[PDB]
């Protein structure tokens, strides 16, 4: 019947969805949430055979194992085993758009397993099998007999196997299809894989069982009282002796308990649900749940006979919290939330889309350590364990239905079609039915990028109906349609409007006050972290803090979707779109994370951690005002550490206990600071330290920090008198200056410093020249589809203007001998096709002390696209182990992404001055640098710089970091000015005007000498 | 002490180039043992009779942002016309110059002074690349005001009718000038982007025969 090409058939014989069950037969075990003998796992070694299409599968496979099959591990994505290639496409579907049809050549994975079943399981009760995740559709067989069918890759499919099993050995046969009508609703921007990627288990339930249960918590005005209501549903033999007891626990103390027989209240003319009961438990002064303090209670639901016989027990963690929208604000337990969130896909560089506990824990610890308090399940229900973890560690969650039809034209072609309503409703309803009891979930999402159709409105209402405790949001069709309680745009900018027809992305500040608008605004996606990005991140957070109704957003996104491949030597390297023969593909657009696939942070993570701090500071004289942005907890594990340093030199320091109530303030007056002797700038640096370890951080953890410039005493003392006088030697070809063991050589043909000698060794491999370009960042390339080349992208404008091809034309090069120095004056003009782009005028003054003062003045044609940078570069002949500097650091920082960096004395190994972005680009820059030390060299002034073994040219010509090769010597790029990196999105110019080098005339000066 | 600051010479040297004389100077402005600003300059006079003045200023970060960063002098001559290539023709400042247009403007010297009843800095014109007055010509990228009244007199006179034209012509040429503000006139109202807080500034002017 080809059910995989019929949106009308999304399952066959599948059991109803419900909350996590373990069918404990002992209440104490359910209370402690210990393992259940009634719940077995079938994960492990299975048999697998790949086929080009289902019609290729031999009939024998249903009854007997295939010799050609191999033994592989499950869960797993078969692309991760090499049976076929994983495909990375963003918007464009991986198959021809001809709904509900899929390619005749449909990759088919035949999984099979021989397992044992204890006769005890078949003598009573019900035995079902559960597939937590199968991509994308499958047929099931047990001992040769067809069982059922299922679709939707992100929610569990359950089947009753009671009448198929036999005591002893049994054999399952699962035929998984890569493509199905279900694929049309799974066009998320990620790797397209397939197989049984989530747990497979066997559950045993009594004939008379708990088939479903809902837990709700209502509160009085001040949350000093609560009522926990638990609706429990049963199946099987309904009798007067049956009872349900719901007891609530706080540790080993039972705080509440209620018992009752079945038979709900009357609801209509036909009566009520005789197979249901609702228990109501009163709880005084309940401990409230939040990401700040994840207080949890344990609820045990016991199905039993009135006289004391337990039939079965189920249970869940209960988080007492109220989520409601009032007067335009999203409130948690009555307080306005400030969502510090991030989008997180389920990705692993080695295992694909298979998740494991360790990876989940690592992510959560890293997220909380970096001040995140929320996560969005982009763009499908997650692995069941994820929610449990979020409940226990404390993270607000946006549970999103597995629905995305981005490739359709228009985007809502299927979501506005009533014939697709059935398939869609199952993706929404089954999600809610599964996760409604998790306190961590505070908002339901109808899916992602599927336009806005009537089906969305229908399902929006369905949820409001069945679960009035959680707000419902959906961004499609404009981000503010009738299908969302929250204005949830993606990449809407802070101050700039993007008036797209039909679906404009207004400036978020302006969006809130549009006539008639009252809803709160929380971006479902913003600050695209693709490669060297997150510029302008601070601008969002300043707005979030100033506008009550701007309540945050979810950064896009958590981790690069890169996969590991191996070279001929068996060495691993990160791969992206197209690296597996997959085509069409969207190359590196699958890597947009704050951390690498292996979870190593990207420089942008620190910027996020800083802007998302929970403590705000203000300075007034000797007083530091600390404000808490916590809504519930007190600062009971925080101490303030302060330090005053003069140009990196520690003068004073100390620590003060932090004792601020949520939303409160605390004043801390610093001691009488001693007026410094030396000249220079005094800097005050404060940091919040967590003395004690927690469940998510180690002792000493730094959660916040801030810097301030204090007093400054400008140096008015003239340096000592020079002993010698530099000597000039002229030739038609050069101007050579000598002073002791030091020598400078200027080429009279090029007009550049071509060499220097410190002692008996040369210092340059390449002449010191002007640089007005940079290896393009992903934000400069600005493309989200490897097929669209936006001529408006910065890289395209620089290329068309000739910035990368302009050649320096010498206009002047003269030498002058002064009383105590030699002066070299030069002027160059860079041109492209008779067009003068830049003009650089310099002077090099080498005096008797051995120092070279380089004064640079540049003119940039007002009509040429603003340049990426304005500085100099050269390849030093030597390679040193350390890089020392007085400026912003220690990590990479750019003009629009440097609030996190601190001014101080930093010292790192050369390697740390290079950021390993998978797709190479300008990187490792450090700004606000007053002094740079490398080997025998020292540069002084006020500049930005990056130093490494890779030239801008190599970075520019290389697609993968693993293909880079250290060049001889060290490449140095010292800029007087550098363009912002942007990142509001990576498919259009996103660098704010204030970070564009548009001044027309620039000036900077550097002093080069020996250390 | 900005109104008290005293120029204290730190350096003053002379050098002869192939076709010019280079005067290098350095000054420090202090008050109560505190260096407010450091002005470093070079003067280059070439054979064409042009004096190129390069100025680099340091402003202590802990001192309030200065009202302006420039040079001034009282010219002996009194011409009746003022010609310049820049924003105009009317008085305009950094945060109030959108209405002015870049072009060649020529007005009588009086028009270069705004008669506010309560005297104060006035008549400035921004984004100027060339200014002509009598036999003088100034080129660069600066703001300037020119009139018969010194900033000192304007600052000491409460009513405009009490102002007296001084001998010669006072010239104020600024590489940078602070915004005037106005959101209200009873509290700091000059927006951050219009405050001279960069710490380090640089500008260049060329003085020559008209
Ligand atoms: O709009 C979006 O932008 C992201 C770009 O990386 C990614 O494709 C998300 O899934 C999509 O919702
Ligand atoms: Mg179907
Ligand atoms: Mg998409
Ligand atoms: Na807000
Ligand atoms: Na992407
Ligand atoms: Na504390
Ligand atoms: Na590249
Ligand atoms: Na006055």
XYZ file of N, CA, C and O in Angstrom, chain A residues 892-957:
264
model
N 40.127 35.849 22.018
C 39.873 36.583 20.795
C 38.709 37.551 21.002
O 37.677 37.180 21.555
N 38.880 38.792 20.561
C 37.829 39.792 20.696
C 37.886 40.813 19.561
O 38.967 41.214 19.128
N 36.715 41.209 19.068
C 36.623 42.184 17.983
C 35.877 43.427 18.442
O 35.280 43.431 19.516
N 35.905 44.506 17.637
C 35.226 45.757 17.993
C 33.790 45.626 18.500
O 33.442 46.245 19.497
N 32.959 44.837 17.822
C 31.583 44.659 18.268
C 31.392 43.407 19.132
O 30.267 43.017 19.443
N 32.504 42.787 19.523
C 32.472 41.621 20.400
C 33.696 41.639 21.322
O 34.564 40.761 21.247
N 33.756 42.636 22.201
C 34.876 42.762 23.126
C 34.489 43.187 24.544
O 35.363 43.470 25.361
N 33.194 43.234 24.847
C 32.771 43.626 26.193
C 33.251 42.607 27.240
O 33.543 42.965 28.383
N 33.347 41.340 26.843
C 33.775 40.284 27.762
C 35.263 40.363 28.105
O 35.666 40.050 29.228
N 36.072 40.782 27.136
C 37.511 40.893 27.333
C 37.830 41.949 28.378
O 37.068 42.897 28.568
N 38.959 41.769 29.056
C 39.415 42.711 30.073
C 40.797 43.268 29.723
O 41.637 42.567 29.156
N 41.024 44.535 30.055
C 42.313 45.156 29.792
C 43.245 44.664 30.882
O 42.914 44.743 32.065
N 44.402 44.145 30.484
C 45.373 43.649 31.445
C 46.608 43.118 30.730
O 46.756 43.276 29.517
N 47.493 42.491 31.496
C 48.716 41.918 30.962
C 48.453 40.444 30.692
O 48.289 39.665 31.625
N 48.405 40.059 29.419
C 48.146 38.667 29.064
C 49.376 37.982 28.474
O 50.217 38.631 27.856
N 49.466 36.668 28.667
C 50.591 35.888 28.163
C 50.119 34.491 27.785
O 49.838 33.665 28.651
N 50.042 34.220 26.490
C 49.578 32.920 26.021
C 50.517 32.280 25.006
O 51.327 32.959 24.376
N 50.427 30.954 24.843
C 51.294 30.292 23.867
C 50.811 30.737 22.491
O 49.636 31.058 22.324
N 51.709 30.776 21.514
C 51.330 31.210 20.171
C 50.040 30.547 19.685
O 49.143 31.221 19.176
N 49.956 29.230 19.851
C 48.793 28.466 19.408
C 47.451 29.036 19.869
O 46.476 28.987 19.123
N 47.402 29.573 21.087
C 46.164 30.144 21.614
C 45.777 31.464 20.955
O 44.715 32.010 21.243
N 46.637 31.979 20.083
C 46.366 33.242 19.404
C 45.712 32.978 18.057
O 45.510 33.885 17.244
N 45.385 31.711 17.833
C 44.732 31.275 16.609
C 43.464 30.507 16.987
O 43.527 29.537 17.739
N 42.315 30.954 16.486
C 41.058 30.272 16.777
C 40.786 29.295 15.635
O 40.641 29.695 14.488
N 40.712 27.992 15.945
C 40.470 26.930 14.961
C 39.071 26.773 14.364
O 38.479 25.693 14.445
N 38.545 27.831 13.754
C 37.233 27.740 13.124
C 37.339 26.683 12.028
O 38.331 26.634 11.308
N 36.332 25.826 11.911
C 36.365 24.769 10.909
C 36.511 25.364 9.510
O 37.294 24.864 8.698
N 35.758 26.423 9.221
C 35.908 27.108 7.942
C 36.814 28.302 8.299
O 36.377 29.253 8.956
N 38.089 28.260 7.872
C 39.065 29.320 8.153
C 38.683 30.726 7.701
O 38.098 30.914 6.630
N 39.039 31.705 8.530
C 38.767 33.110 8.249
C 39.642 33.972 9.157
O 40.378 33.451 10.001
N 39.574 35.287 8.982
C 40.322 36.193 9.852
C 39.934 35.717 11.247
O 38.765 35.387 11.491
N 40.900 35.672 12.159
C 40.621 35.185 13.499
C 41.706 35.578 14.488
O 42.756 36.091 14.106
N 41.434 35.320 15.764
C 42.392 35.593 16.820
C 42.720 37.031 17.156
O 43.619 37.283 17.959
N 42.011 37.981 16.562
C 42.286 39.382 16.853
C 42.077 39.697 18.333
O 41.276 39.057 19.008
N 42.817 40.688 18.821
C 42.712 41.184 20.194
C 42.748 42.703 20.033
O 43.599 43.234 19.319
N 41.828 43.400 20.687
C 41.753 44.851 20.553
C 42.266 45.632 21.759
O 42.702 45.052 22.753
N 42.204 46.958 21.649
C 42.641 47.837 22.720
C 44.014 47.504 23.266
O 44.252 47.607 24.473
N 44.919 47.110 22.375
C 46.278 46.740 22.757
C 47.241 47.935 22.720
O 47.404 48.605 21.685
N 47.874 48.186 23.863
C 48.809 49.289 24.009
C 50.254 48.816 23.882
O 51.160 49.623 23.675
N 50.467 47.509 23.995
C 51.807 46.953 23.897
C 51.789 45.481 23.522
O 51.076 44.689 24.132
N 52.592 45.121 22.525
C 52.686 43.739 22.065
C 54.137 43.249 22.109
O 55.042 43.923 21.612
N 54.351 42.076 22.705
C 55.685 41.493 22.828
C 55.769 40.127 22.172
O 55.001 39.227 22.500
N 56.712 39.974 21.249
C 56.904 38.710 20.554
C 58.383 38.547 20.249
O 58.955 39.332 19.491
N 58.998 37.527 20.838
C 60.418 37.307 20.623
C 61.208 38.522 21.081
O 61.055 38.969 22.224
N 62.069 39.082 20.220
C 62.848 40.257 20.620
C 62.075 41.554 20.380
O 62.462 42.616 20.865
N 60.973 41.448 19.646
C 60.151 42.599 19.277
C 59.113 43.107 20.279
O 58.540 42.339 21.049
N 58.881 44.417 20.241
C 57.874 45.059 21.069
C 57.256 46.182 20.250
O 57.970 47.003 19.671
N 55.926 46.199 20.182
C 55.205 47.239 19.457
C 54.338 47.966 20.472
O 53.686 47.338 21.309
N 54.336 49.290 20.394
C 53.554 50.112 21.303
C 52.676 51.109 20.550
O 52.992 51.507 19.427
N 51.572 51.497 21.187
C 50.624 52.434 20.608
C 49.221 52.107 21.093
O 49.010 51.878 22.287
N 48.259 52.080 20.173
C 46.869 51.765 20.508
C 46.269 51.096 19.274
O 45.661 51.747 18.430
N 46.424 49.779 19.197
C 45.988 49.027 18.031
C 45.309 47.690 18.321
O 45.167 47.281 19.474
N 44.905 47.024 17.239
C 44.284 45.703 17.287
C 45.280 44.799 16.556
O 45.974 45.254 15.645
N 45.355 43.528 16.927
C 46.308 42.651 16.260
C 45.939 41.183 16.363
O 45.144 40.793 17.211
N 46.538 40.383 15.486
C 46.391 38.932 15.506
C 47.760 38.428 15.065
O 48.449 39.084 14.279
N 48.168 37.280 15.589
C 49.479 36.735 15.284
C 49.385 35.213 15.178
O 48.803 34.563 16.041
N 49.937 34.651 14.106
C 49.878 33.210 13.893
C 50.799 32.752 12.766
O 51.531 33.549 12.177
N 50.729 31.457 12.464
C 51.534 30.844 11.416
C 50.764 30.765 10.102
O 51.229 30.154 9.138
N 49.593 31.398 10.058
C 48.758 31.373 8.857
C 48.488 32.770 8.322
O 48.003 33.636 9.045
N 48.794 32.984 7.048
C 48.574 34.281 6.425
C 47.105 34.458 6.057
O 46.377 33.476 5.878
N 46.674 35.711 5.941
C 45.304 35.996 5.557
C 45.050 35.309 4.221
O 43.943 34.839 3.952
N 46.086 35.234 3.390
C 45.959 34.600 2.086
C 45.662 33.110 2.184
O 44.808 32.603 1.464
N 46.374 32.399 3.053
C 46.131 30.970 3.190
C 44.748 30.754 3.801
O 43.977 29.932 3.322
N 44.443 31.493 4.861
C 43.145 31.378 5.519
C 42.029 31.545 4.499
O 41.040 30.820 4.510
N 42.226 32.496 3.599
C 41.274 32.836 2.549
C 41.121 31.751 1.481
O 40.045 31.584 0.907
N 42.197 31.018 1.210
C 42.171 29.985 0.183
C 41.930 28.587 0.732
O 41.963 27.618 -0.022
